[PDB]
Design a protein around this ligand. Structure first.
Ligand SMILES: COc1cc2c(cc1OC)[C@@H](C)C(=O)N(C)C=C2
Length: 112
């Protein structure tokens, strides 16, 4: 089916985002933001819907995503949270921009 084939492409992208190739800029997105550990006590007041690649991986593994659009919405939510919370000149935003470039260019190669 088309949805299953598109979800295989999505899983391929997810594997790439978690791969050693991108680890130098992907690592902040590997696990949920630990606001308390980072001293960011305003994080959960500003970010209402946290998202990270471990959560996307669990949702893919559990067949939670019904289509590519639903998968992409979570990956973009993860980047949007970073752009909303952090000053735009922060290193973590530079890392987000680089990983989002990897994501958007490969997502665009979605099979029809
Ligand atoms: C490099 O220091 C930071 C790491 C992280 C974060 C802010 C950091 O410094 C401000 C949070 C808020 C975030 O957006 N992500 C994606 C994860 C980790």
């Amino acid at each position: 089916g088309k949805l299953s084939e598109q979800l295989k492409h999505c899983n391929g992208i997810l594997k790439e985002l978690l791969s050693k190739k991108h680890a130098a800029y992907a690592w902040p997105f590997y696990k949920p933001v630990d606001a308390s550990a980072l001293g960011l006590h305003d994080y959960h007041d500003i970010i209402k819907h946290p998202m990270d690649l471990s959560t996307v991986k669990r949702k893919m593994e559990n067949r939670d995503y019904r289509d590519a659009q639903e998968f992409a919405a979570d990956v973009r939510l993860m980047f949007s949270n970073c752009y909303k919370y952090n000053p735009p000149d922060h290193d973590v935003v530079a890392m987000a921009r680089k990983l989002q470039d990897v994501f958007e260019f490969r997502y665009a190669k979605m099979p029809d």
